[PDB]
Design an enzyme around this catalytic site. Structure first.
Site, short mmCIF file in Angstrom:
data_model
loop_
_atom_site.label_atom_id
_atom_site.label_comp_id
_atom_site.label_asym_id
_atom_site.label_seq_id
_atom_site.Cartn_x
_atom_site.Cartn_y
_atom_site.Cartn_z
N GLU A 357 1.14 11.73 2.92
CA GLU A 357 1.96 10.99 3.86
C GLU A 357 1.46 11.02 5.26
OE1 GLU A 357 4.83 9.01 3.12
OE2 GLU A 357 3.77 9.14 1.21
N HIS A 487 7.94 -4.42 -11.52
CA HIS A 487 7.25 -5.27 -10.60
C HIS A 487 7.35 -6.70 -11.00
CE1 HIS A 487 5.56 -1.41 -9.42
NE2 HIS A 487 5.21 -2.00 -8.29
ZN LIG Z 1 0.96 6.12 -0.34
#
Ligand SMILES: [Zn+2]
Lengths: 596, 195
Positions: A357, A487
């Site tokens: 992150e 998706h």
């Molecule tokens: Zn990522």
């Protein structure tokens, strides 16, 4: 006055107006996500509307300026983006219909339920429940009930709706001059520039195909190994020559094969390296985890985090009253504010996640200088890749020793190395074939090659030929299997994933060479080398200013995707695999059916 | 033994907008810079022309006490020979300027939750500012050759926009208060020496 002149002034008006409206919108979303209350939802909605209104009116305002007249690259890139002209083209009535269809589909997926044939009472939704059976159980019969069920109830409902969606979207695209919806999607990777940096929409298809052919030999061997091992656990069902039955592969849709690790460990006795226990002994805390990560980044050469990050971010699970959304996320609010939200527990996995992150934040900080419209990653794939590279380096045995988590004298052995590699492969190699297939089916459906009558037939045929899996039970035309995956039913492009993987490895090899690692690539660590950092930084700062091809060249020395680096990383495994299945048949025969 | 009133200027409750610059002539008094010469709260004491290391022995005609508040990154543009929006259409420094530029961060006083909307700046102008000049005109800027006709229109925009300072911004976007002390000296007795 040149239109160039007029254009530059217009673009300045927009820039300050855009940033401030966006910031407000963003702040509101953070607040909802951190404290979930009804009042917050309202505020979020109100603010968002204002931002959209601005963009739409402005976009409409700017279809007016001729694109050809401008003669400076940067300005042109900016104008183009504002002029994208998506969706509005359709008539209002049509627009309304499309919106309804899209919404209905998302709802069905989320609220859908499936039930045990044996016990009528038990009915389970997907996220809590169906998933667990698929992920952890080892009974053939149980697994079957679930696979069929999701498909039978959610899927059958979705098919009539999907058919309409295909048609409408295609119309929209035709109006905007792309040939079919598929083209629109492939449009992202298209660049026009002068010196051999041009990439064309059609070329993507060819490149993806070429790369796949190279990866095929590895997949075939892996497939075989899994087959032999699985045969022991479910003895009767699998057949030596034939493809693996689908329900037994580890997740509802088959995307990743990671869950199969317990069954297939190559050398069982020696254990995997886990540092969780040690961390507890040394009393690390959440902030400590974050603090350590920062040091790694600093060592490579990138900058330290700002004061605000430390103060405003929610690095720990909130205590007391508020309710919090749990996904680990990185936020760039805008105008200088960068924040990370996650709940951290002292576990090894969190050490690794933190590194990913923070990586996303570092990229963002870098591209700040560029103008507002151009502040984003070069192609969709690049952003995720940057982050992953960092994580790989951290997990290496060497790094852990320096931090002090591992005991000083641990020396790894061949067996452990092989074990590590396999685990990685099940996740990375396994996904690649699936991704290719799904995207191909979709592109074809949109184009018109596959008639509606034959949609289901083709899906299954393709799976058998390319990915080696076979249907548990016969499925007719009414069913719509591809739709079940998230998706697909929520309108997103799936190509990003294939590309990202190829890129990651390419970057790593290059960086490692500058850092002078000698040995297998699997052991490379980029820590403590300034040079590596500088090279990466040069790419990061560009943002979307220059074409993607140019950027890749700066770091790695070539203008196109290549799969040679991936193959090198997994080379130690390949040799071992080859010895193991020397006796067994490699390949699949499409004929066998568990239909029997 | 009249002390120049530099004091009441630094700690004023509010400063005007960027385009409404405030000018005060300070003459016939005694100004001592050694009070802030050792204190050093400011990020920048950057000076041009006169060395701060005990050069108050000279005599000057008048003292200009320019003061305003701007964004952080733009602090640089308050320097000779630099071109940027603030320089182009807001305030100007001649290349030959002699005097001191002092600036500090005052997020705490200036920033308001929900934004503070009282500070404004001029984005576009027909031309460039000439030295030490003030334009307060609010007439709408026109980019189009087609007449604006005094209404908002295509290629027609109002000159000023608001900073909108908020507490959670980065160091670059946070409000910075700037004071420029200019020591103007000409052919005169120059009673303002500051012993
Ligand atoms: Zn990522």
């Amino acid at each position: 006055q040149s239109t160039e002149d007029l254009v530059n002034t217009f673009l300045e008006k927009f820039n300050y107006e855009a940033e401030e409206l966006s910031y407000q919108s963003s702040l509101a979303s953070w607040d909802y996500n951190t404290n979930i209350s009804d009042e917050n939802v309202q505020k979020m909605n109100n603010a968002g509307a204002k931002w959209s209104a601005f963009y739409e009116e402005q976009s409409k305002l700017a279809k007016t300026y001729p694109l050809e007249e401008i003669q400076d690259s940067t300005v042109k890139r900016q104008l183009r983006a504002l002029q994208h002209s998506g969706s509005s083209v359709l008539s209002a009535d049509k627009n309304q219909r499309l919106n309804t269809i899209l919404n209905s589909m998302s709802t069905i997926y989320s609220t859908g339920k499936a039930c045990n044939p044996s016990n009528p009472q038990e009915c389970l939704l997907l996220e809590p429940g169906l998933d667990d059976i698929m992920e952890n159980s080892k009974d053939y019969n149980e697994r079957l009930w679930a696979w069929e069920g999701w498909r039978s109830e959610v899927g059958k409902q979705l098919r009539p709706l999907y058919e309409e969606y295909v048609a409408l979207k295609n119309e929209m695209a035709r109006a905007n001059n792309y040939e079919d919806y598929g083209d629109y999607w492939r449009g992202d990777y298209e660049e026009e520039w002068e010196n051999g940096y041009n990439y064309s929409r059609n070329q993507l298809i060819d490149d993806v195909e070429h790369t796949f052919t190279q990866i095929m030999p590895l997949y075939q061997h892996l497939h075989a190994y899994v087959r032999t091992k699985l045969m022991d656990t479910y003895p009767s069902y699998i057949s030596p020559t034939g493809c693996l039955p689908a329900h037994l592969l580890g997740d509802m849709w088959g995307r990743f094969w990671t869950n199969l690790y317990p069954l297939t460990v190559p050398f069982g006795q020696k254990p995997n390296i886990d540092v969780t226990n040690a961390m507890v002994n040394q009393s690390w805390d959440a902030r400590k985890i974050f603090k350590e990560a920062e040091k790694f980044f600093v060592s490579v050469g990138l900058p330290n985090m700002t004061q605000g990050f430390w103060e405003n971010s929610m690095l720990t699970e909130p205590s007391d009253s508020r309710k919090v959304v749990c996904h680990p996320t990185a936020w760039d609010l805008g105008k200088g504010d960068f924040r990370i939200k996650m709940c951290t527990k002292v576990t090894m996995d969190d050490f690794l996640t933190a590194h990913h992150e923070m990586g996303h934040i570092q990229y963002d900080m870098a591209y700040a200088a560029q103008p507002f419209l151009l502040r984003n990653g070069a192609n969709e794939g690049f952003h995720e890749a940057v982050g992953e590279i960092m994580s790989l380096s951290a997990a290496t045995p060497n790094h852990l020793k320096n931090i002090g988590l591992l005991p000083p004298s641990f020396f790894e052995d061949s067996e452990t190395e092989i074990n590590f590699l396999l685990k990685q492969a099940l996740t990375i190699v396994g996904t690649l074939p699936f991704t290719y297939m799904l995207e191909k089916w979709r592109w074809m459906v949109f184009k018109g090659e596959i008639p509606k009558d034959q949609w289901m037939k083709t899906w299954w045929e393709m799976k058998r030929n390319i990915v080696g899996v076979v249907e548990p039970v016969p499925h007719d035309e009414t069913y719509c299997d591809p739709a079940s995956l998230f998706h697909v039913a929520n309108d997103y492009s799936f190509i990003r994933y294939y590309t990202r993987t190829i890129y990651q490895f390419q970057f790593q090899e290059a960086l490692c060479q500058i850092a002078k690692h000698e040995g297998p690539l699997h052991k490379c660590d980029i820590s403590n080398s300034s040079e590596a950092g500088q090279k990466l930084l040069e790419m990061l700062k560009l943002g979307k200013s220059k074409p993607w091809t140019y950027a890749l060249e700066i770091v790695v020395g070539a203008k196109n995707m290549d799969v040679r680096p991936l193959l090198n990383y997994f080379e130690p495994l390949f040799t071992w695999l080859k010895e193991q299945n020397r006796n067994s048949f490699v390949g699949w025969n499409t004929d066998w059916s568990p239909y029997a | 033994t009249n002390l120049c009133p530099f004091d009441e200027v630094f700690n004023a409750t509010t400063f005007a907008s960027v385009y409404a610059w405030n000018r005060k002539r300070i003459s016939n008094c005694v100004a001592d810079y050694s009070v802030l010469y050792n204190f050093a709260p400011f990020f920048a004491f950057k000076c041009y022309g006169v060395s701060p290391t005990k050069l108050n022995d000279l005599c000057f005609t008048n003292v200009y006490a320019d003061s305003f508040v701007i964004r952080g990154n733009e602090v640089s543009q308050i320097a000779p020979g630099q071109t940027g929006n603030i320089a182009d259409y807001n305030y100007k420094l001649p290349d030959d300027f002699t005097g001191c530029v002092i600036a500090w961060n005052s997020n705490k006083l200036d920033s308001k939750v929900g934004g503070n909307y009282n500070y404004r700046y001029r984005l576009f102008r027909k031309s460039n500012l000439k030295p030490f000049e003030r334009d307060i005109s609010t007439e709408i800027y026109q980019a189009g050759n087609k007449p604006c006709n005094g209404v908002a229109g295509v290629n027609c925009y109002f000159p000023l926009q608001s900073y909108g300072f908020r507490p959670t911004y980065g160091v670059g976007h946070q409000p910075y208060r700037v004071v420029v002390l200019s020591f103007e000296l000409l052919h005169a007795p120059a009673t303002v020496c500051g012993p």
